Amino acid sequence: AYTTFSQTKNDQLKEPMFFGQPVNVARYDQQKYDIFEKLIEKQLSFFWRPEEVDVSRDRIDYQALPEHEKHIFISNLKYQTLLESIQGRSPNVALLPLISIPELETWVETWAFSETIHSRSYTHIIRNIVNDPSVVFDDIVTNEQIQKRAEGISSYYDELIEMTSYWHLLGEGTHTVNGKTVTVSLRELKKKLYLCLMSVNALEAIRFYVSFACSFAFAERELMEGNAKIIRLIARDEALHLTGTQHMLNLLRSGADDPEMAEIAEECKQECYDLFVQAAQQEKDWADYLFRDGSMIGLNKDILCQYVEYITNIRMQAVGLDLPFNTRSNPIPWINTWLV
Amino acid sequence: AYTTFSQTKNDQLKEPMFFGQPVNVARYDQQKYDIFEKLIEKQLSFFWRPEEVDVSRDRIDYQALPEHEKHIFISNLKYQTLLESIQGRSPNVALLPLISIPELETWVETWAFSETIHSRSYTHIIRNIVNDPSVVFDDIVTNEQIQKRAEGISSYYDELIEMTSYWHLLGEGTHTVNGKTVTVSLRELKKKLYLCLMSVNALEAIRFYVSFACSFAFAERELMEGNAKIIRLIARDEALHLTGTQHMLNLLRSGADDPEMAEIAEECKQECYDLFVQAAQQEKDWADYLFRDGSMIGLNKDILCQYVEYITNIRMQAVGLDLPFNTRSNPIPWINTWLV
Ligand SMILES: [Fe+3]
Ligand SMILES: [Fe+3]
Ligand SMILES: [Fe+3]
Ligand SMILES: [Fe+3]
Ligand SMILES: [Hg+2]
Ligand SMILES: [Hg+2]
Ligand SMILES: [Hg+2]
Ligand SMILES: [Hg+2]
Ligand SMILES: [Hg+2]
Ligand SMILES: [Hg+2]
Ligand SMILES: [Hg+2]
Ligand SMILES: [Hg+2]
Ligand SMILES: [Hg+2]
Ligand SMILES: [Hg+2]
Ligand SMILES: [Hg+2]
């Protein structure tokens, strides 16, 4: 079972990242993995408040935009808001019960916290461009075109969360619950975790970035500049979050942290590959609904599609997966002005 | 049955604080209880970086302290560290899965995050006043005296978490798990949450404050100035935290939220009372250890006992409970200088 304070004095430097003894003392003078303490420090140094960003001229910019451009901007915004909503709570509820080293535990809480700030920034933006925010917020839950990735993303988390509860409550083995057999396997739980993480890595590394291009295209035209300044800050944060998930995944697949996970990851590589391509395909299909009424300056269905493949190749290679698309240089180098 | 993004489009203004539909969209343009949005805003405005606080003068001060005074200081510090370690993760793991309104969800995450900053501040303090932090950190886990004073905190959170898992997995009813009859009652789970909340309130409003007094006793002597600045910053945050729990509890008691919670608050009021009485006694019993090698001018077992009764009455009155201790004036008015 899970405990908020394991009474056993353990060497936190020897525990695996996940599934070891629950973290008792929160100390930051040492760590098994330096990267996580460095990320906490960086994230704290980047603290920012949405309210301190002037977005007063974004309202007029939005109203003056052609209808299809309003659609593009607002549709993209709703999706970003959806992703931040999930990322604000999910890392905590899903990972906290499985972490066994203090630096990773606090990094996850810090990572999640920074996501709630992003959520607050989107409320700030929405309240300053539509007059009646409720219209926007409600269409997030029910929007068909958006509620497909949410289902897929939330699914990975929910299944991991469910299996984690069974593991903590019953432990490994073949159990029975109300006439049904319930098998609890640590190997499968480990695979499930490797899956949220890969999926979360694609979310942080691909899904968010594709939306940033959608957003900075306006900035390039000196429009929605308040929104742009906020996205710049958010993007600076996401870079840290993806760095964190990339290290977690690489440490798990290399075999140094947990040999069993390395074994499991090698076994489900084809699955992770398809999982990544699937994510990229969903982002591509979205371009349709986004540019169904037309495209805009420096951005269209084809360009975005190219960008998705460009970014995906990079991210997948970073975690040891084969490249699914043809290699080529950045289709939209101008994006670098707003990112890194 | 828990989900990271419920697909049902619900009116978040009509959900109860707890046990309603899990929060889907994180919006901050409106709230059922604006007090939580105000608390998030205030906590964000108080953001501080522990490492920025100059504690270089603390090593000299500490080493020059009489041995019994070093024992008092460090023992107090180790307990505070324990409480922050627990408070950094528990709010998230125990409450997050049960919150049904966005403002409360984010407040809990913000509250927990601020506690991790406090934990980081203690590492900063420890690392700068002793040769080997590991001895201090390891003693926290062991040391029967410290765990004696904290006995009941981790255990309560753990019970709630386990019951919550059963609820999410099996739902309401009487079940058969591995041949054993397991009862899952929402009413009983609500009681567990309610009493956990009262326990955290006692933790936030009493346990932390009795420790601040010991810390500020050194500040009064012009010693441990760095630690003092940090404690003032921590105390400022704890004031928001206890304001948060007091409001949660009193809102539940009012009957304006979940009607059943109002019933429960009334039914278990003796439980609430007993919790404080027990916590106060634990804080008092800690005196024998704290002063085992001797006391200090203005800080001894008697004064500690008097302050515990003083503050406990204040906190209990704040949530509608009878006062167990004889009324008295502040036994250490010099603390005001350092608080609020
Ligand atoms: Fe974000
Ligand atoms: Fe992120
Ligand atoms: Fe704290
Ligand atoms: Fe607190
Ligand atoms: Hg996931
Ligand atoms: Hg795009
Ligand atoms: Hg995989
Ligand atoms: Hg994958
Ligand atoms: Hg594409
Ligand atoms: Hg393409
Ligand atoms: Hg509790
Ligand atoms: Hg004290
Ligand atoms: Hg009760
Ligand atoms: Hg009560
Ligand atoms: Hg007393």
φ, ψ dihedrals at A192, nearest 5°: -55, -45
> Is B120 in contact with A169 (Cβ distance < 8 A)?
no
- A150 close contact with B: CB closer than 8 A: yes
**CA pair distance B272, B254, nearest whole angstrom:** 16
Query: Mapping DSSP to helix (H, G, I), strand (E, B) and coil, where does residue B209 land?
Result: helix
* Contact indicator for B187, A30 with CB cutoff of 8 Å: no
- A94 close contact with B: CB closer than 8 A: yes
> Is B25 in contact with A161 (Cβ distance < 8 A)?
no
Which residues have CB under 8 Å from B148's CB, separation 6+? Answer: B282, B285, B286
> Is B27 in contact with A137 (Cβ distance < 8 A)?
yes
Name every chain A residue with its beta carbon within 8 A of the beta carbon of B120.
26, 28, 40, 106
Q: How far is the alpha carbon of B106 from chain A, nearest alpha carbon, in Å? A: 7
Beta bridge partners of A299: A296
Kindly state the tokens that stand for A279. 């994510």
Output the CA B261–ligand 11 centroid distance in Å: 16
Angstrom CA distances, B18 to A116, B39, B320, stand at 19, 18, 21
Output the CA B63–ligand 12 centroid distance in Å: 21
Which residues have CB under 8 Å from A312's CB, separation 6+? Answer: A206, A276, A277, A279, A280, A324, A325
Helix spans in chain B (H):
34-45, 56-63, 67-90, 102-127, 133-141, 144-150, 153-170, 186-202, 208-219, 225-254, 259-267, 269-285, 287-290, 301-318
Q: How far is the alpha carbon of A3 from chain B, nearest alpha carbon, in Å? A: 5
Positive or negative, the Cα torsion across B89, B92, B98, B103?
A: positive
Q: Which of A85, A194, A65 is nearest to A130 (CA)?
A: A65
> What type of residue is A176?
T
φ, ψ dihedrals at A173, nearest 5°: 135, 180
**CA pair distance A33, A22, nearest whole angstrom:** 17
Catalytic residue among A122, A157, A307, A310: A122
DSSP code for B23: P
Name every chain A residue with its beta carbon within 8 A of the beta carbon of B88.
26, 106, 109
Kindly state the tokens that stand for B60. 């000299």
Angstrom CA distances, A35 to A129, A234, B115, stand at 39, 20, 21
Query: Catalytic amino acids of B?
Result: 122
Distance between alpha carbon A185 and the CA centroid of its chain, in Å? 27
> What type of residue is B25?
V
**CA pair distance B89, A93, nearest whole angstrom:** 10
Ligand nearest to the CA of B319: 14
3 state SS for B49-80: CHHHCCCHHHHHHHHCCCHHHHHHHHHHHHHH
* Contact indicator for B103, B34 with CB cutoff of 8 Å: yes
Kindly state the tokens that stand for B234. 């921590």
- Residue B183: its H or E element: strand B180-184
Name every chain B residue with its beta carbon within 8 A of the beta carbon of A140.
24-25
* Contact indicator for B185, B192 with CB cutoff of 8 Å: no
Active site residue A122: yes
**CA pair distance B43, B244, nearest whole angstrom:** 11
**Which residue in A has a C-alpha nearest to residue B146's C-alpha?**
A7
Cβ atoms within 10 Å of A176's Cβ, excluding its own: 12
Query: Mapping DSSP to helix (H, G, I), strand (E, B) and coil, where does residue B222 land?
Result: coil
Angstrom CA distances, A79 to A115, A149, A253, stand at 14, 9, 31
3 state SS for chain A: CCCCCCCCCCCCCCCCCECCCCCCCCCCCCCCCHHHHHHHHHHHHCCCCHHHCCCCCHHHHHHHCCHHHHHHHHHHHHHHHHHHHHHHHHHHHHHCCCECCHHHHHHHHHHHHHHHHHHHHHHHHHHCCCCCHHHHHHHHHHCCCCCCHHHHHHHHHHHHHHHHHHHHHHCCEEEEECCEEEEECHHHHHHHHHHHHHHHHHHHHHHHHHHHHHHHHHHHCCCCHHHHHHHHHHHHHHHHHHHHHHHHHHHHHHCCCCHHHHHHHHHCHHHHHHHHHHHHHHHHHHHHHHCCCCCECCECHHHHHHHHHHHHHHHHHHCCCCCCCCCCCCCCHHHHHCCC
Q: Which of A101, A109, A111, A108 is nearest to A31 (CA)?
A: A101
> Is B7 in contact with A178 (Cβ distance < 8 A)?
no
**CA pair distance B280, B311, nearest whole angstrom:** 9
Q: Which of B15, B29, B26, B40 is nearest to B98 (CA)?
A: B15
Distance between alpha carbon A288 and the CA centroid of its chain, in Å? 23
- A174 close contact with B: CB closer than 8 A: no
Cβ atoms within 10 Å of A133's Cβ, excluding its own: 18
Kindly state the tokens that stand for B67. 């041995």
Beta bridge partners of B334: none
Name every chain B residue with its beta carbon within 8 A of the beta carbon of A88.
26, 106, 109
Pairing of strands B180-184, A173-177: unpaired
* Contact indicator for A315, A205 with CB cutoff of 8 Å: yes
* Contact indicator for A107, B116 with CB cutoff of 8 Å: no
This structure's resolution (angstroms)?
1.9
What CATH number did the domain enclosing B166 receive?
1.10.620.20
> Is A5 in contact with B170 (Cβ distance < 8 A)?
no
Order of strands, sheet of B173-177, starting from the edge strand that comes earlier in the sequence: A180-184, A173-177, B173-177, B180-184
Name every chain B residue with its beta carbon within 8 A of the beta carbon of A110.
113, 116
DSSP code for B177: E
Q: Which of B155, B175, B157 is nearest to B166 (CA)?
A: B175
Distance between alpha carbon B313 and the CA centroid of its chain, in Å? 17
What are the b/e assignments for A216-244, b being 16+ CB within 10 Å? bbbbbeebbbbbbbbbbbbbbbbbbbbbb
- A169 close contact with B: CB closer than 8 A: yes
Substitution target in A80, A165, A170, A196 with the highest count of B β-carbons within 10 Å is A165
**CA pair distance A228, B201, nearest whole angstrom:** 41
Total domains in the fold of chain A: 1
Q: Which domain holds residue A333?
A: 1-340
- The method recorded for this entry reads X-ray
**CA pair distance A201, A239, nearest whole angstrom:** 11
> Which residues 115-134 of chain A have a CB within 8 Å of chain B?
116-117, 119-120, 123, 126-127, 133-134
> Which residues 45-64 of chain A have a CB within 8 Å of chain B?
45, 47, 49
Substitution target in A8, A89, A95 with the highest count of B β-carbons within 10 Å is A89
Angstrom CA distances, B101 to A80, B17, B22, B104, B234, stand at 20, 6, 8, 6, 27
> Is A109 in contact with B106 (Cβ distance < 8 A)?
no
- A233 close contact with B: CB closer than 8 A: no
Name every chain B residue with its beta carbon within 8 A of the beta carbon of A2.
93, 158, 161-162
For helices A259-267 and A269-290, what crossing angle results, to 10°? 60
**CA pair distance A176, B149, nearest whole angstrom:** 40
**Which residue in A has a C-alpha nearest to residue B165's C-alpha?**
A165
Burial category of A24 from C-beta neighbours within 10 Å (exposed 0-12, middle 13-18, buried 19 and up)? buried
**CA pair distance A209, A239, nearest whole angstrom:** 9
Output the CA B194–ligand 14 centroid distance in Å: 8
φ, ψ dihedrals at A326, nearest 5°: -70, 135
Q: Which of B299, B308, B302 is nearest to B334 (CA)?
A: B299
Distance between alpha carbon B316 and the CA centroid of its chain, in Å? 15
Cβ atoms within 10 Å of B340's Cβ, excluding its own: 8
How many C-alpha atoms does B242 have within 13 Å on its Cβ side? 23
Q: How far is the alpha carbon of B25 from chain A, nearest alpha carbon, in Å? A: 6
> Is B170 in contact with A150 (Cβ distance < 8 A)?
no
* Contact indicator for B332, B307 with CB cutoff of 8 Å: yes
Q: Which of B85, B7, B193, B97 is nearest to A90 (CA)?
A: B97
- Separation of first and last alpha carbons in chain A: 43
Ligand nearest to the CA of A209: 6
Name every chain A residue with its beta carbon within 8 A of the beta carbon of B83.
none
Candidates B24, B85, B120; nearest CB to A24: B85
**CA pair distance B4, B148, nearest whole angstrom:** 37
Burial category of B121 from C-beta neighbours within 10 Å (exposed 0-12, middle 13-18, buried 19 and up)? buried
> Is B141 in contact with A27 (Cβ distance < 8 A)?
no
Name every chain B residue with its beta carbon within 8 A of the beta carbon of A168.
162, 165
> Is A154 in contact with B89 (Cβ distance < 8 A)?
no
- B39 close contact with A: CB closer than 8 A: no
> What type of residue is A120?
R
Which residues have CB under 8 Å from A181's CB, separation 6+? Answer: A174, A175
Beta bridge partners of B180: B177
Query: Mapping DSSP to helix (H, G, I), strand (E, B) and coil, where does residue B327 land?
Result: coil
Q: Which of B298, B268, B91, B120 is nearest to B187 (CA)?
A: B268
Kindly state the tokens that stand for A290. 């986004």
> What Rg value do the Cα atoms of chain A yield, rounded?
21
